[PDB]
Write a protein that binds this ligand. Structure first.
Ligand SMILES: Nc1ncnc2c1ncn2[C@@H]1O[C@H](CSCC[C@H](N)C(=O)O)[C@@H](O)[C@H]1O
Length: 327
DNA sequence: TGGATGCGCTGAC
DNA sequence: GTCAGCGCATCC
């Protein structure tokens, strides 16, 4: 994450729904905002959350009475994506994990915050011929909010990862916010090899598979794209090896393959997946963030998370728009 | 809501 | 045809 000198969100209160690692909390707090409520039902996510913020998030949002939720100015929610991701079965709203948005609508309808800041996977924008996004748009609209949605790639915001996600910013209508803008892309100057830990700390991640098939030549020049160098097995998910001179592939929560949830990388002649701390860095998390003691749970959490830097630039722009109140 | 890995199919070229 | 995906079902 980056440093924010102008705390655009000072004095504002927000809630952290589907909290996970608290990515939205880090981003909004760096802008001066105050978290007044968090909700996360996963046991291990709750532990790492408390480990970093000192509070245990409330469980199952579907069982929480929205009237009990504290007053807040900004509602943050990176809701479940398994049902909309290009990597899943795309059952969408028909999935028991695909209807969490209506819980968000329920909370908004009752708490009516100034802003609703949501995030989901790229395919969310195309799912069901665009009907899924349309439904969220109309729901927000009839809830009396404006709807700003756009898919941003983390590689355009200083993070070496081709992670694309849809960001949806909603302003209450009575606020007449007419100058909100998604952050503009800038040149990437950080690559995977810049975030890697020393070899001595990741030796245990070195995999020597005799079915490795290097398909491409290593590149000596850094590039803002993923560069596949080879595969193992059939080259499916978690079976692809990339260059550390390029950018990382999207970190995943339930990913499979020998290089599960991170992808494989060529590092000083050996192939290995990423270390939880490297996943943290690829997601824009500061080294001060405490990862979960279970590497398995940490991989799942970072793969489910958000890119801090991207949320910071957005949060900053949300605050800039809310603070523009000329006579 | 364990940890691990082989997998298959969709989306966007 | 190329290839990447906050995934999936199964195994222990
Ligand atoms: N019914 C429910 N109640 C509360 N939390 C839920 C939930 N269904 C899913 N979740 C939580 O929703 C999260 C979605 S992924 C969001 C991660 C978050 N942005 C962070 O930065 O890491 C998961 O952690 C999941 O456990």
């Amino acid at each position: 994450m980056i440093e924010i000198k102008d705390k655009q969100l000072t004095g504002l209160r927000f809630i952290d729904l589907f909290a996970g690692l608290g990515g939205f909390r880090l981003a909004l707090e760096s802008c001066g905002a105050e978290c007044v409520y968090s909700n996360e039902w996963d046991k291990y996510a709750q532990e790492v959350y408390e480990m970093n913020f000192g509070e245990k998030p409330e469980g199952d949002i579907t069982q929480v009475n929205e009237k009990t939720i504290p007053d807040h100015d900004i509602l943050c929610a990176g809701f479940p994506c398994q049902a909309f991701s290009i990597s899943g079965k795309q059952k969408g709203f028909e999935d028991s994990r695909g209807t969490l948005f209506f819980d968000i609508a329920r909370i908004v309808r009752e708490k009516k915050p100034k802003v609703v800041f949501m995030e989901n996977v790229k395919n969310f924008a195309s799912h069901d011929n665009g009907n899924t996004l349309e439904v969220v748009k109309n729901t927000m609209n009839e809830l009396d909010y404006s709807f700003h949605a756009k898919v941003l790639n983390a590689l355009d915001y200083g993070i070496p990862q081709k992670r694309e996600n849809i960001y949806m910013i909603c302003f209450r209508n009575d606020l007449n916010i007419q100058n909100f803008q998604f952050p503009k892309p800038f040149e990437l100057n950080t690559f995977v090899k810049d975030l890697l830990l020393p070899d001595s700390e990741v030796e245990h991640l070195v995999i020597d598979r005799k079915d490795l098939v290097m398909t491409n030549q290593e590149i000596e020049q850094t590039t803002p794209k993923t560069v596949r160098l080879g595969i193992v097995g059939k080259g499916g998910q978690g079976e692809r090896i990339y260059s550390t001179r390029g950018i990382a592939i999207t970190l995943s929560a339930y990913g499979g393959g020998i290089f599960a949830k991170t992808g494989g990388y060529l590092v000083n002649g050996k192939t290995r997946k990423l270390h939880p701390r490297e996943c943290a860095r690829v997601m824009g998390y500061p080294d001060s963030y405490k990862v979960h003691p279970s590497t398995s749970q940490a991989y799942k959490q970072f793969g489910n998370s958000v890119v801090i830097n991207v949320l910071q630039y957005i949060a900053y722009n949300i605050g800039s728009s809310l603070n523009f109140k000329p006579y």
